[PDB]
Structures are given as structure tokens and as C-alpha cells.
């Protein structure tokens, strides 16, 4: 059997529906689900020569630097056809999985007003109470703090970390961190932290489950996940076939329809319901910021050290 690791909950259930049977039908190989994706567990299984995750959905900045570290198999591009894949996310070790945004999600009926901008989300006087942000070092929170502090979209990089941390310090005691997707959904839906910066598709899933949530796409911050194969998988050929399948046009359109994330196959949009395609992150362009995952990949360890040290300060 092939094991696919992803971010759990609604997103991984949707990837399972969109990809698993298609793979089983095409190859006769059964797909098993595991996770949540955890870079420490990925590195540990590679180092133990005990790889149990054959294909992993990871953040693109992690994917772009994990290959040279010896964590990943080089992808087989004689099997994976890069001709229809989003070229921004193809490396020797990875291809794109889906394109997403950090947005300002809000449990509208639990608050006096939903924050519309990053500046609003950073204004505890006007928008009181707890707010939620991603716990782990990754593109998004630092950029949102800089945007809330008046940095224009085109001037974010190189990141001014001191400025971002000073801006985060103004609201630090009012942050409840989300470690993963389901926790972000719990925090918003319960009104424990009724607004925050969240993965857009997690708000689509809450709405799909009947929960009333509002999303502001103002200065939404884009990024992408990738599919990678940990170094030492015992199912290498099957992993490459799974990535070729998961990134094919229909499979990507089905993932997008099921999640609210944008596809990373250039022939997928045309297969989708136009009413659904219009709402995807790659169409929410009126006021949008693009996170630079290559910049993060080049400085990943250093930003991470600073991020965790600041959290503990």
C-alpha cells in the first residue's frame, strides 16, 4: 500500500476523495492516509531508514529547501509530466499540490464587527478580544504584521523581522495560536478566537458543514503546498505515479472543487463549475499579496530560530 501524509481533517478528507480512488483504479495500489504532516517526524523517519510516508503534502518553502538537506527523493520527471504543472512550484524534489491564501476568517455573529484588513486584525481597541494566528514558523504571520504596520505589498522582502516582531508584540497577549487546520476551525467556530489569519479552505469547509463564517480577502496572502517523496520510501515508483495522478487536470479540479483551494495544473480551471472557480484564491486578486516561498526557503532555519525565540520572549 502507498501512504499519503497531509494536514488532516477536512483538507485531507477532500484530497482522499479527489485522488485515492483514481490512483487505485489506475494502478491497483491502495492509498492509506497518515499525518498530520510534521517535518520533525519526516526527518526522523528518513534518518531511521524507516520511511512510512510515501507522498507528503508539505509547505512550499519547506519543499524548496528539503532536497539539498538529503530529506527527499529527486522526483522522476519521466513519469511526472511538468508540462501542465504550475511552474512556480516545480523543483527537482517537488511539484505543487494546491495554491491557497491566508485570509481573515471571522465568526461574524459572535463579534461586534469582523476585521476586514490586517490593520483591523492588529487593532485590539477597535476589534477587541482574542485573535488566532498560525503557530509554526512559515510564510504568513510576519508578512501580515508588516502589512498591518503599513509596509506595501511590493516592499515586504527582505523581511524586516524586528519590525514584524514589534508589531506582533502590540497584540501578543491576545493571540491564541493554531497548530493545525482543525484547531483553527475550532477556534473560529467556538468564538474562543473569533477571528484570525487562517487557511482559506478551512473556512470553506466550515461553511460546507453549515457553520456561519465570513472571510475577508483584503490583502490575502498567497502560498502553495507541494508534494514530495521522503528519501528512503520503499514505494518510490508508486509515489511518483501518485504525484503524476494527484497533479493531473481532473484530479486537481476535483481537489479544488472539494476544498476551495486553487489547482496547480493549468488545464484544471476549465473543468470546474465557473461559480466555484471564481471564488478560488488565484481569482481573489483585487487586493492580494504573494508570499515568497523561495525567499523563505533560502532563510528557513534562521527565520525559524528568530520566530521561536520571539514567541518565548
Amino acid at each position: 500500500d502507498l501512504v499519503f501524509s497531509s494536514w488532516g481533517g477536512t483538507t485531507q478528507d477532500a484530497q482522499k476523495a479527489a485522488w485515492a480512488e483514481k490512483f487505485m483504479v489506475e494502478t491497483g495500489i491502495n492509498v492509506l492516509q497518515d499525518g498530520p504532516t510534521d517535518y520533525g517526524k519526516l526527518k526522523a523517519m528518513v534518518e531511521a531508514n524507516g520511511v512510512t510516508w510515501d507522498v507528503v503534502d508539505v509547505e512550499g518553502d519547506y519543499a524548496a529547501q528539503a532536497g539539498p538537506k538529503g530529506l527527499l527523493e529527486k522526483l522522476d520527471f519521466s513519469v511526472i509530466d511538468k508540462t501542465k504543472l504550475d511552474p512556480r512550484f516545480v523543483t527537482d524534489y517537488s511539484v505543487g499540490s494546491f495554491y491557497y491564501s491566508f485570509v481573515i476568517g471571522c465568526n461574524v455573529d459572535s463579534v461586534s464587527a469582523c476585521p476586514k484588513s490586517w490593520a483591523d486584525l492588529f487593532d485590539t481597541a477597535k476589534f477587541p478580544g482574542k485573535r488566532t494566528f498560525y503557530k509554526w514558523s512559515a510564510p504568513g504571520v510576519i508578512e501580515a504584521a508588516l502589512l498591518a504596520d503599513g509596509v506595501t505589498a511590493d516592499k515586504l522582502y527582505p523581511l524586516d523581522l524586528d519590525r514584524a516582531f514589534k508589531k506582533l508584540d502590540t497584540i501578543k497577549s491576545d493571540i491564541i495560536w493554531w497548530s493545525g487546520g482543525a484547531q483553527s476551525q475550532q477556534l473560529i467556530a467556538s468564538a474562543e478566537a473569533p477571528f484570525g489569519s487562517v487557511w482559506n479552505g478551512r473556512m470553506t469547509a466550515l461553511e460546507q458543514s453549515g457553520v456561519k463564517v465570513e472571510t475577508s480577502w483584503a490583502q490575502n496572502i498567497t502560498a502553495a503546498d507541494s508534494l514530495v517523496v521522503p528519501k528512503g520510501t520503499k514505494n518510490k515508483d508508486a509515489a511518483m505515479k501518485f504525484i503524476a495522478l494527484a497533479t493531473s487536470a481532473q484530479a486537481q479540479a476535483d481537489m479544488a472543487t472539494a476544498t476551495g483551494y486553487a489547482p496547480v495544473n493549468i488545464e484544471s480551471a476549465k473543468l470546474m463549475d465557473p461559480k466555484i472557480a471564481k471564488s478560488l484564491p488565484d481569482q481573489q486578486t483585487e487586493s492580494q499579496v504573494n508570499a515568497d516561498m523561495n525567499y523563505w526557503a533560502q532563510h528557513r532555519d534562521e527565520i525559524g530560530e528568530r520566530w521561536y525565540a520571539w514567541q518565548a520572549k
Side-chain angles (χ1 to χ4, degrees), residues 170-313:
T170 72
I171 65 159
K172 200 180 186 189
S173 72
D174 280 321
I175 297 175
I176 296 178
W177 303 99
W178 54 267
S179 294
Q183 179 165 45
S184 74
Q185 290 168 303
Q186 179 269 122
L187 289 169
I188 299 293
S190 68
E192 188 175 339
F195 42 68
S197 177
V198 297
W199 293 321
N200 73 280
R202 294 286 169 165
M203 298 303 97
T204 295
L206 275 174
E207 179 171 296
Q208 281 169 349
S209 192
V211 181
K212 187 176 174 184
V213 288
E214 202 163 88
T215 292
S216 175
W217 293 90
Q219 300 178 303
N220 69 93
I221 300 163
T222 65
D225 276 14
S226 304
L227 299 180
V228 300
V229 177
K231 187 153 196 80
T233 169
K234 62 169 277 308
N235 304 128
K236 192 174 169 182
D237 295 340
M240 304 302 163
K241 290 176 185 174
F242 181 85
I243 292 178
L245 180 281
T247 65
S248 64
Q250 194 64 62
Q252 280 283 312
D254 295 349
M255 174 279 302
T257 296
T259 59
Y261 290 126
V264 290
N265 183 300
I266 75 198
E267 301 196 345
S268 295
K270 70 179 178 198
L271 307 173
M272 300 178 64
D273 181 332
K275 126 226 176 123
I276 296 166
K278 246 193 91 79
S279 64
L280 305 179
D282 61 349
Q283 301 293 318
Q284 300 280 188
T285 61
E286 192 159 277
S287 177
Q288 185 171 69
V289 175
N290 305 119
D292 187 339
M293 299 189 297
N294 288 136
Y295 176 87
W296 273 80
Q298 292 178 225
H299 305 266
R300 206 176 179 282
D301 299 329
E302 194 48 44
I303 299 166
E305 283 188 22
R306 295 190 59 189
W307 171 260
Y308 296 119
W310 165 77
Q311 279 185 323
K313 177 169 69 72

Side-chain angles (χ1 to χ4, degrees), residues 122-128 131:
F122 279 76
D123 191 332
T124 61
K126 192 135 150 103
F127 299 88
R131 49 262 288 142

Side-chain angles (χ1 to χ4, degrees), residues 15-310:
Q15 292 173 306
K16 176 184 172 175
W19 301 343
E21 279 188 319
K22 278 179 189 70
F23 189 64
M24 291 158 186
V25 166
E26 187 207 277
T27 70
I29 301 155
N30 175 221
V31 177
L32 301 178
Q33 305 296 323
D34 201 7
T37 295
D38 181 303
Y39 307 136
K41 292 186 188 206
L42 196 158
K43 178 185 157 92
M45 68 176 64
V46 167
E47 291 187 338
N49 186 207
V51 172
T52 64
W53 293 350
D54 301 307
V55 173
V56 188
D57 180 307
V58 298
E59 287 151 326
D61 68 297
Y62 169 86
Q65 58 87 70
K69 284 186 178 184
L71 293 158
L72 307 179
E73 292 291 351
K74 276 186 183 282
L75 295 190
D76 185 348
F77 291 105
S78 78
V79 172
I80 298 152
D81 177 13
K82 65 173 79 169
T83 72
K84 291 174 194 178
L85 307 186
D86 191 314
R88 291 168 294 186
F89 317 119
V90 172
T91 79
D92 284 356
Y93 300 91
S94 64
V95 295
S97 180
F98 61 92
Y99 182 87
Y100 67 92
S101 293
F102 288 101
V103 297
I104 304 173
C106 180
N107 178 332
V108 60
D109 293 342
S110 67
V111 294
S112 176
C114 289
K116 188 180 43 69
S117 67
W118 295 117
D120 296 339
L121 186 59
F122 279 76
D123 191 332
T124 61
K126 192 135 150 103
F127 299 88
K130 302 302 182 303
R131 49 262 288 142
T132 187
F133 289 100
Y134 188 36
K135 188 172 172 60
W136 309 116
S137 187
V141 176
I142 286 162
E143 290 83 351
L146 289 161
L147 296 161
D149 200 42
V151 178
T152 64
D154 45 20
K155 303 257 270 176
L156 285 166
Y157 303 96
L159 296 169
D160 187 339
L161 299 182
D162 282 348
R163 179 176 179 170
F165 294 142
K166 285 180 176 176
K167 183 58 166 175
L168 285 155
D169 279 348
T170 72
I171 65 159
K172 200 180 186 189
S173 72
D174 280 321
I175 297 175
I176 296 178
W177 303 99
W178 54 267
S179 294
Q183 179 165 45
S184 74
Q185 290 168 303
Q186 179 269 122
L187 289 169
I188 299 293
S190 68
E192 188 175 339
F195 42 68
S197 177
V198 297
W199 293 321
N200 73 280
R202 294 286 169 165
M203 298 303 97
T204 295
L206 275 174
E207 179 171 296
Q208 281 169 349
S209 192
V211 181
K212 187 176 174 184
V213 288
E214 202 163 88
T215 292
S216 175
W217 293 90
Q219 300 178 303
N220 69 93
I221 300 163
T222 65
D225 276 14
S226 304
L227 299 180
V228 300
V229 177
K231 187 153 196 80
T233 169
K234 62 169 277 308
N235 304 128
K236 192 174 169 182
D237 295 340
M240 304 302 163
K241 290 176 185 174
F242 181 85
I243 292 178
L245 180 281
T247 65
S248 64
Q250 194 64 62
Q252 280 283 312
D254 295 349
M255 174 279 302
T257 296
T259 59
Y261 290 126
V264 290
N265 183 300
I266 75 198
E267 301 196 345
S268 295
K270 70 179 178 198
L271 307 173
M272 300 178 64
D273 181 332
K275 126 226 176 123
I276 296 166
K278 246 193 91 79
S279 64
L280 305 179
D282 61 349
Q283 301 293 318
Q284 300 280 188
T285 61
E286 192 159 277
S287 177
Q288 185 171 69
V289 175
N290 305 119
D292 187 339
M293 299 189 297
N294 288 136
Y295 176 87
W296 273 80
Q298 292 178 225
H299 305 266
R300 206 176 179 282
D301 299 329
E302 194 48 44
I303 299 166
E305 283 188 22
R306 295 190 59 189
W307 171 260
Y308 296 119
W310 165 77

